[PDB]
Design a protein around this motif. Structure first.
Motif, PDB file in Angstrom:
ATOM      1  N   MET A 154      15.992  12.177   3.878  1.00 34.60           N
ATOM      2  CA  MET A 154      14.656  12.669   3.584  1.00 34.60           C
ATOM      3  C   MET A 154      13.684  11.507   3.601  1.00 34.60           C
ATOM      4  SD  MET A 154      15.949  15.760   2.724  1.00 34.60           S
ATOM      5  CE  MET A 154      14.495  16.535   2.024  1.00 34.60           C
ATOM      6  N   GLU A 155      12.540  11.688   4.258  1.00 33.17           N
ATOM      7  CA  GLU A 155      11.677  10.554   4.568  1.00 33.17           C
ATOM      8  C   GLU A 155      10.873  10.075   3.368  1.00 33.17           C
ATOM      9  OE1 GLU A 155      11.536  10.324   9.136  1.00 33.17           O
ATOM     10  OE2 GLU A 155      12.327   9.143   7.470  1.00 33.17           O
ATOM     11  N   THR A 156      10.237  11.003   2.646  1.00 39.84           N
ATOM     12  CA  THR A 156       9.616  10.779   1.332  1.00 39.84           C
ATOM     13  C   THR A 156       8.523   9.703   1.356  1.00 39.84           C
ATOM     14  OG1 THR A 156      11.846  11.224   0.516  1.00 39.84           O
ATOM     15  CG2 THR A 156      10.117  10.815  -1.087  1.00 39.84           C
ATOM     16  N   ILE A 157       7.423  10.025   2.021  1.00 37.25           N
ATOM     17  CA  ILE A 157       6.295   9.109   2.117  1.00 37.25           C
ATOM     18  C   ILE A 157       5.633   8.973   0.752  1.00 37.25           C
ATOM     19  CG2 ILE A 157       5.887   9.585   4.541  1.00 37.25           C
ATOM     20  CD1 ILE A 157       3.470  11.338   3.383  1.00 37.25           C
ATOM     21  N   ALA A 158       4.958   7.846   0.539  1.00 34.95           N
ATOM     22  CA  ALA A 158       4.093   7.653  -0.620  1.00 34.95           C
ATOM     23  C   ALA A 158       2.972   6.721  -0.192  1.00 34.95           C
ATOM     24  CB  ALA A 158       4.856   7.086  -1.810  1.00 34.95           C
ATOM     25  N   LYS A 159       1.736   7.093  -0.489  1.00 31.49           N
ATOM     26  CA  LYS A 159       0.577   6.385   0.025  1.00 31.49           C
ATOM     27  C   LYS A 159      -0.305   5.877  -1.103  1.00 31.49           C
ATOM     28  CE  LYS A 159      -0.878   9.646   3.066  1.00 31.49           C
ATOM     29  NZ  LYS A 159       0.145  10.589   3.573  1.00 31.49           N
ATOM     30  N   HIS A 160      -0.934   4.738  -0.871  1.00 30.75           N
ATOM     31  CA  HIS A 160      -2.064   4.283  -1.661  1.00 30.75           C
ATOM     32  C   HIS A 160      -3.227   4.136  -0.700  1.00 30.75           C
ATOM     33  CE1 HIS A 160      -4.722   2.576  -4.435  1.00 30.75           C
ATOM     34  NE2 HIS A 160      -4.293   1.330  -4.468  1.00 30.75           N
ATOM     35  N   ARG A 161      -4.110   5.121  -0.700  1.00 31.11           N
ATOM     36  CA  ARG A 161      -5.234   5.169   0.213  1.00 31.11           C
ATOM     37  C   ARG A 161      -6.429   4.525  -0.464  1.00 31.11           C
ATOM     38  NH1 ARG A 161      -7.686   8.960   1.921  1.00 31.11           N
ATOM     39  NH2 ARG A 161      -7.922   8.313   4.104  1.00 31.11           N
ATOM     40  N   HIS A 162      -7.317   3.940   0.345  1.00 29.47           N
ATOM     41  CA  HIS A 162      -8.457   3.136  -0.079  1.00 29.47           C
ATOM     42  C   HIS A 162      -8.038   2.041  -1.048  1.00 29.47           C
ATOM     43  CE1 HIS A 162     -10.104   6.630   1.740  1.00 29.47           C
ATOM     44  NE2 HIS A 162     -10.056   7.380   0.655  1.00 29.47           N
ATOM     45  N   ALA A 163      -7.032   1.260  -0.671  1.00 29.15           N
ATOM     46  CA  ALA A 163      -6.533   0.211  -1.545  1.00 29.15           C
ATOM     47  C   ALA A 163      -7.488  -0.966  -1.549  1.00 29.15           C
ATOM     48  CB  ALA A 163      -5.151  -0.242  -1.095  1.00 29.15           C
ATOM     49  N   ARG A 164      -7.939  -1.356  -2.736  1.00 26.26           N
ATOM     50  CA  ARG A 164      -8.916  -2.431  -2.899  1.00 26.26           C
ATOM     51  C   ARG A 164      -8.254  -3.787  -2.626  1.00 26.26           C
ATOM     52  NH1 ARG A 164     -13.660  -3.564  -1.918  1.00 26.26           N
ATOM     53  NH2 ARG A 164     -12.503  -5.315  -0.989  1.00 26.26           N
ATOM     54  N   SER A 165      -8.078  -4.060  -1.331  1.00 19.25           N
ATOM     55  CA  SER A 165      -7.529  -5.283  -0.754  1.00 19.25           C
ATOM     56  C   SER A 165      -7.616  -5.150   0.757  1.00 19.25           C
ATOM     57  CB  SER A 165      -6.073  -5.544  -1.157  1.00 19.25           C
ATOM     58  OG  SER A 165      -5.728  -6.904  -0.994  1.00 19.25           O
ATOM     59  N   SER A 166      -7.457  -6.266   1.460  1.00 17.74           N
ATOM     60  CA  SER A 166      -7.552  -6.233   2.913  1.00 17.74           C
ATOM     61  C   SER A 166      -6.212  -5.895   3.542  1.00 17.74           C
ATOM     62  CB  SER A 166      -8.029  -7.568   3.450  1.00 17.74           C
ATOM     63  OG  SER A 166      -8.499  -7.415   4.771  1.00 17.74           O
ATOM     64  N   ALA A 167      -6.258  -5.429   4.791  1.00 15.54           N
ATOM     65  CA  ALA A 167      -5.037  -4.995   5.461  1.00 15.54           C
ATOM     66  C   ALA A 167      -4.160  -6.175   5.838  1.00 15.54           C
ATOM     67  CB  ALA A 167      -5.381  -4.173   6.697  1.00 15.54           C
ATOM     68  N   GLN A 168      -4.769  -7.321   6.137  1.00 13.07           N
ATOM     69  CA  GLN A 168      -3.997  -8.506   6.494  1.00 13.07           C
ATOM     70  C   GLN A 168      -3.334  -9.116   5.267  1.00 13.07           C
ATOM     71  OE1 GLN A 168      -4.768 -12.822   8.713  1.00 13.07           O
ATOM     72  NE2 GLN A 168      -6.381 -11.282   8.548  1.00 13.07           N
ATOM     73  N   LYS A 169      -4.067  -9.162   4.151  1.00 14.77           N
ATOM     74  CA  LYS A 169      -3.555  -9.768   2.927  1.00 14.77           C
ATOM     75  C   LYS A 169      -2.427  -8.945   2.320  1.00 14.77           C
ATOM     76  CE  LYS A 169      -7.841 -12.006   1.514  1.00 14.77           C
ATOM     77  NZ  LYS A 169      -9.184 -11.508   1.107  1.00 14.77           N
ATOM     78  N   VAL A 170      -2.409  -7.636   2.581  1.00 22.88           N
ATOM     79  CA  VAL A 170      -1.311  -6.797   2.110  1.00 22.88           C
ATOM     80  C   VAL A 170      -0.191  -6.767   3.136  1.00 22.88           C
ATOM     81  CG1 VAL A 170      -0.725  -4.506   1.262  1.00 22.88           C
ATOM     82  CG2 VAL A 170      -2.884  -5.472   0.723  1.00 22.88           C
ATOM     83  N   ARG A 171      -0.552  -6.841   4.419  1.00 27.17           N
ATOM     84  CA  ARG A 171       0.419  -6.840   5.506  1.00 27.17           C
ATOM     85  C   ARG A 171       1.319  -8.061   5.439  1.00 27.17           C
ATOM     86  NH1 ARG A 171      -3.170  -5.721  10.082  1.00 27.17           N
ATOM     87  NH2 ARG A 171      -3.159  -3.489   9.591  1.00 27.17           N
ATOM     88  N   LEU A 172       0.771  -9.172   4.949  1.00 30.20           N
ATOM     89  CA  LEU A 172       1.549 -10.382   4.707  1.00 30.20           C
ATOM     90  C   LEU A 172       2.657 -10.140   3.689  1.00 30.20           C
ATOM     91  CD1 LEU A 172       0.592 -13.269   5.893  1.00 30.20           C
ATOM     92  CD2 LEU A 172       0.103 -13.759   3.534  1.00 30.20           C
ATOM     93  N   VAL A 173       2.391  -9.305   2.689  1.00 32.26           N
ATOM     94  CA  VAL A 173       3.402  -8.992   1.684  1.00 32.26           C
ATOM     95  C   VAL A 173       4.316  -7.875   2.172  1.00 32.26           C
ATOM     96  CG1 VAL A 173       3.692  -8.078  -0.642  1.00 32.26           C
ATOM     97  CG2 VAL A 173       2.063  -9.892  -0.226  1.00 32.26           C
ATOM     98  N   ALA A 174       3.748  -6.871   2.848  1.00 27.76           N
ATOM     99  CA  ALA A 174       4.527  -5.725   3.310  1.00 27.76           C
ATOM    100  C   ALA A 174       5.513  -6.095   4.407  1.00 27.76           C
ATOM    101  CB  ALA A 174       3.601  -4.618   3.807  1.00 27.76           C
ATOM    102  N   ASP A 175       5.326  -7.238   5.070  1.00 28.66           N
ATOM    103  CA  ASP A 175       6.311  -7.656   6.063  1.00 28.66           C
ATOM    104  C   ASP A 175       7.510  -8.358   5.428  1.00 28.66           C
ATOM    105  OD1 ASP A 175       4.254  -6.700   7.672  1.00 28.66           O
ATOM    106  OD2 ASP A 175       4.470  -8.283   9.170  1.00 28.66           O
ATOM    107  N   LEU A 176       7.632  -8.312   4.094  1.00 27.09           N
ATOM    108  CA  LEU A 176       8.755  -8.970   3.427  1.00 27.09           C
ATOM    109  C   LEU A 176       9.828  -7.978   3.003  1.00 27.09           C
ATOM    110  CD1 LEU A 176       7.266 -11.747   1.114  1.00 27.09           C
ATOM    111  CD2 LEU A 176       8.268 -11.929   3.385  1.00 27.09           C
ATOM    112  N   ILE A 177       9.454  -6.718   2.782  1.00 25.76           N
ATOM    113  CA  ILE A 177      10.392  -5.721   2.282  1.00 25.76           C
ATOM    114  C   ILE A 177      10.682  -4.630   3.304  1.00 25.76           C
ATOM    115  CG2 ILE A 177       9.838  -6.162  -0.102  1.00 25.76           C
ATOM    116  CD1 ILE A 177       8.272  -3.325   0.259  1.00 25.76           C
ATOM    117  N   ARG A 178      10.551  -4.917   4.591  1.00 27.19           N
ATOM    118  CA  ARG A 178      10.913  -3.933   5.596  1.00 27.19           C
ATOM    119  C   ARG A 178      12.420  -3.919   5.780  1.00 27.19           C
ATOM    120  NH1 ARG A 178       7.461  -5.402   9.113  1.00 27.19           N
ATOM    121  NH2 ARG A 178       5.815  -4.153   8.120  1.00 27.19           N
ATOM    122  N   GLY A 179      13.018  -2.738   5.657  1.00 24.79           N
ATOM    123  CA  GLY A 179      14.445  -2.594   5.805  1.00 24.79           C
ATOM    124  C   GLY A 179      15.264  -2.988   4.601  1.00 24.79           C
ATOM    125  N   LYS A 180      14.640  -3.448   3.523  1.00 26.54           N
ATOM    126  CA  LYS A 180      15.394  -3.932   2.383  1.00 26.54           C
ATOM    127  C   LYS A 180      15.888  -2.775   1.524  1.00 26.54           C
ATOM    128  CE  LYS A 180      16.466  -7.194   0.964  1.00 26.54           C
ATOM    129  NZ  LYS A 180      17.517  -8.235   1.077  1.00 26.54           N
TER     130      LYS A 180
END
Lengths: 48, 103, 142, 55, 117, 110, 150
Positions: F1-27
């Motif tokens: 089951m895929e089970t998405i969860a979103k935080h929309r309009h997150a008060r931060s930039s996409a690059q500054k969060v993408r830097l962190v989100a590229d650490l827990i892919r597949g973990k």
RNA sequence: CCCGGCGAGGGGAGUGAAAAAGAACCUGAAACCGUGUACGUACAAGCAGUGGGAGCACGCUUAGGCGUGUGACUGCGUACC
RNA sequence: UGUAACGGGGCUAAACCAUGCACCGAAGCUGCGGCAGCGACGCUUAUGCGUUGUUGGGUAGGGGAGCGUUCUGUAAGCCUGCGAAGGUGUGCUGUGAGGCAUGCUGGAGGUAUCAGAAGUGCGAAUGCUGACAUAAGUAACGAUAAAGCGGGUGAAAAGCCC
């Protein structure tokens, strides 16, 4: 006859010159008045 | 087992049974054609090189189809001289199925 | 039907020994370039390395006509302030003899990745011995 | 001191290739409480190397 | 009437952007660069139909020269022999014979070497 | 089951969060939580809250067993940047963009 | 266009393009180059050309068998169902009825019928003779459209 | 109802014909920014294409190969107004 | 600035002079296939069929023939909730502008043919308006009067309260 069968005589309509509508249209980009000079200008040309 | 022959302004080198695409002929979609002008017939080792159109040998071919090829697009352009032009082109063919290389 | 095109896997490249003992540099190098490019094989293809590996022995015994033993100068630049280094023929024959036939063949080869590959084909040695006896190379006299 | 023409997205990602964060290798497990913590750091619970130091 | 031109401009831009598929960078996305790239491609394609007809001929000539020099005759004297024997096999089929059928090329070499002497 | 969860309009930039989100892919999501705990960035706080909420959704809205979950697809993409006038010198104006983001975490057992 | 005739910025010195009005047609919200006026598109037809086209149209209305001559056409009540039954009985669906004297009994009970318009003999017009599938015409109205035209 | 900070935002539930119609709300393009897969790329120089062309990966089949995507190598080629 | 006065390698011919025969070499010419313009000639001149000959680089510019958009008549007709306009893929097709069919999204309009009228076709005007990049996660965070610690409160305290 019908209204969607009427047609003018061959040679009645000439459809006009649209100056400035592309490269392939013949005239277009200067529209048949050459490059710079008083005749090239908007409202220009010497009087009679 | 192959033959070299002049079909439509150019030589072909065809073997037995294979299908070759060449220029348009006045042959129907279901008829026969006989290329009696054969330039070079090689059979195993015996190679009959043709001081032109060698001796006797006649290629039998059947026309498969008559369609037009892929469209090439002619773009004629001249930079800063206010001139460009396009033209498409689709070149007819006939696909002949070689039915027999006569020796 | 289409034409033929050689494939970079199904090409068969023989090994060759050439002795440069007392030969003209340019005519030797020209036949080396001819074999290394692949201009002699019937399945010649311009975009495929169809050349044969060539071993060239006695590379200090290659000769030149005229005064080119003392007059032919080899210029190359170090890429620096003003360092243009030059060497004549005899000093290069003394110091690095193989580089004479290396530069001579490398000028007659195509330019780009393929010319660099068909120069990797060439194995030139200054001595009479070579260590490539595992490849069983035929004698090429020209 | 200004660009002559714009740099591509290609040259953007190449520069940002070295900007990648490095995750910690692993945390430690304390001997008594067994909770995870950084190496050589006291726990959030106040334990460090089998010894409660701060309430 | 007032003619709005959203759909016809979008059609004219999708037409050019569809031909720019496979181009690097803004030549595949940005319309102006795509249009210049497409017209440059058409110019090159015209020129390279002509250059294709040249380049394949010089490839066949090099292959016939190599295979004839394998048999002991240069390409010029080989073509002169085939012309003096009135053999109209062109350079395409002589290259195809040169690669595929070595004994037929050997017989053509022997025919030219008979005709020249 | 895929089970998405979103935080929309997150008060931060996409690059500054993408830097962190590229650490827990597949973990595996325990090690993903421990990584986001011991990363010293505000995007780690945001992404860790979305990961905990995705765990909660995968336990409640569908069946069970967070011990077999794994982060399939986490991606951040920018949202509606709001425009603010920053006064620069010599009388001219400047429009700085407070950038937001959308953080989507997709965690499954598969 | 409602606006002022003031230059929106300088002529030189500013980095932007030259401009001298915000009512310029290049600009947004301020505009049209060749704006339109109310104009009379009616073009003169010669009387001999109008009557020649009318004679050609009537001749082809005969020759395509779309001309029907009925001696008396009237309805005895202003009910439209009577006219509808009359045109149903005559196998008529889309007709122009030309009567030489405009009676109101026929004109009122042809108002609500879509395909049926009843004209006086003076109100004959050429697009109405083409546009209708059949034209029925009173005998004295045929005599009238004769003595008008030829 | 659950996560969350008696939030924001989200996942279920329920309404609805439709909730990628959820109030930032019909359709929702392009630029712009991502994630995944196929191919290429870390010894090779330049309007980034074009003509030739191997390999690899997908579909299919008269089992010969085609079609799709990338495309090492190679000739030619200094954008538009 | 670097050989730097054969394009380079290199060449005692791979230089020069004379003779000779081959070959390479253009979009030239020829072969085959197709399109068009012009002129003669006969078919019985749907003022189109054919046969031949010749022409077909093009700026400014002249002349000729068409495509497409929006709107009016045809049209209270025809297509359409067993799915329109739009958007987005695919495949055919024309010499081209283009056309047609169809998968997905959309959820209510579209419009043949033949005529008529144009706010009729944008890449450029330091064009106008909105959106979004680029430099770039860079400079900077606004007086060099200065902060440190304990407790609180809170989900979170260098900055708040004491």
């Amino acid at each position: 006859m019908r209204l969607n069968t009427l047609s003018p005589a061959e040679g009645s309509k000439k459809a006009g010159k649209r100056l400035g509508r592309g490269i392939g249209s013949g005239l277009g980009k200067t529209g048949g008045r050459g490059h710079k000079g008083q005749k090239s200008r908007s409202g220009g040309g010497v009087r009679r | 087992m192959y033959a070299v022959f002049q079909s439509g302004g150019k030589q072909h080198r065809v073997s037995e049974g294979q299908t070759v695409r060449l220029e348009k002929l006045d042959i129907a979609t279901g008829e026969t054609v006989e290329f009696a002008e054969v330039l070079m017939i090689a059979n195993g080792e015996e190679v009959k090189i043709g001081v032109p159109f060698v001796d006797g040998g006649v290629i039998k071919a059947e026309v498969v189809a008559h369609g037009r090829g892929e469209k090439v697009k002619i773009v004629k352009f001249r930079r800063r001289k206010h001139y460009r032009k396009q033209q498409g082109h689709r070149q007819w063919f006939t696909d002949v199925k070689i039915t027999g290389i006569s020796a | 039907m289409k034409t033929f095109t050689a494939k970079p896997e199904t090409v068969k490249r023989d090994w060759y020994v050439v002795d440069a003992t007392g030969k003209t540099l340019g005519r030797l190098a020209t036949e080396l370039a001819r074999r290394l490019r692949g201009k002699h094989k019937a399945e010649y293809t311009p975009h495929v390395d169809t050349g044969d590996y060539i071993i060239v022995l006695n590379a200090d015994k290659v000769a030149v006509t005229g005064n080119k033993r003392t007059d032919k100068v080899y210029y190359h630049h170090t890429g620096h302030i003003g360092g243009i280094k030059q060497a004549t023929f005899e000093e290069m024959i003394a110091r690095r003899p193989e580089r004479v036939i290396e530069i001579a063949v490398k000028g007659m080869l195509p330019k780009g990745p393929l010319g660099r590959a068909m120069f990797r084909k060439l194995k030139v040695y200054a001595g009479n011995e070579h260590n490539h006896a595992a490849q069983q190379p035929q004698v090429l006299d020209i | 001191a200004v660009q002559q023409n714009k740099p591509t997205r290609s040259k953007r990602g190449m520069r940002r290739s070295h900007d990648a964060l490095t995750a910690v290798t692993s945390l430690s497990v304390d001997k008594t409480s067994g909770e995870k913590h950084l190496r050589h750091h006291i726990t959030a619970d106040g334990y460090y190397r089998g010894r409660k130091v701060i309430a | 009437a007032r003619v709005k031109r959203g759909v016809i401009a979008r059609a004219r831009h999708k037409k050019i952007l569809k031909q720019a598929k496979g181009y690097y960078g803004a030549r595949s996305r940005v319309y102006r660069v795509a249009f210049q790239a497409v017209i440059k491609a058409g110019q090159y394609a015209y020129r390279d139909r002509r250059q294709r007809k040249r380049q394949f001929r010089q490839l066949w000539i090099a292959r016939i020269n190599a295979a004839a020099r394998q048999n002991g005759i240069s390409y010029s004297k080989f073509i002169n022999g085939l012309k003096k024997a009135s053999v109209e096999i062109d350079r395409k089929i002589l290259a195809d014979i040169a690669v595929f059928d070595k004994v037929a090329f050997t017989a053509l070499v022997e025919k030219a070497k008979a005709a020249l002497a | 089951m895929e089970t998405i969860a979103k935080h929309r309009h997150a008060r931060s930039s996409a690059q500054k969060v993408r830097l962190v989100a590229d650490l827990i892919r597949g973990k595996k999501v325990s090690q993903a939580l421990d990584i986001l705990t011991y990363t010293n960035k505000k995007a780690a706080v945001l992404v860790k809250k979305v990961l905990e909420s995705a765990i909660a959704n995968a336990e409640h809205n569908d069946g069970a067993d967070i011990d077999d979950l794994k982060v399939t697809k986490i991606f951040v993409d920018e949202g509606p940047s709001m425009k603010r006038i920053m006064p620069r010198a010599k009388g001219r104006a400047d429009r700085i963009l407070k950038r937001t983001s959308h953080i989507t975490v997709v965690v499954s057992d598969r | 266009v409602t606006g002022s005739g003031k230059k929106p910025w300088r002529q030189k010195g500013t980095g932007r393009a030259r401009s001298g009005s915000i009512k310029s047609p290049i600009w947004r919200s301020g505009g049209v180059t060749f704006a339109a006026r109310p104009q009379d598109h009616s073009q003169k037809v010669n009387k001999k050309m109008y009557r020649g086209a009318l004679k050609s149209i009537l001749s082809e209305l005969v020759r395509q068998d779309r001309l029907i001559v009925v001696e008396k056409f009237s309805v005895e009540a202003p009910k439209t169902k009577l006219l509808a039954q009359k045109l149903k009985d005559m196998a008529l669906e889309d007709v122009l009825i030309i009567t030489g004297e405009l009676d109101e009994n026929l004109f009122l009970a042809a108002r609500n019928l879509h395909k049926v318009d009843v004209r006086d003999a003076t109100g004959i017009d050429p697009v109405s003779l083409i546009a209708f599938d059949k034209v029925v015409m009173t005998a004295d109205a045929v005599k009238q459209v004769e003595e008008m035209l030829a």
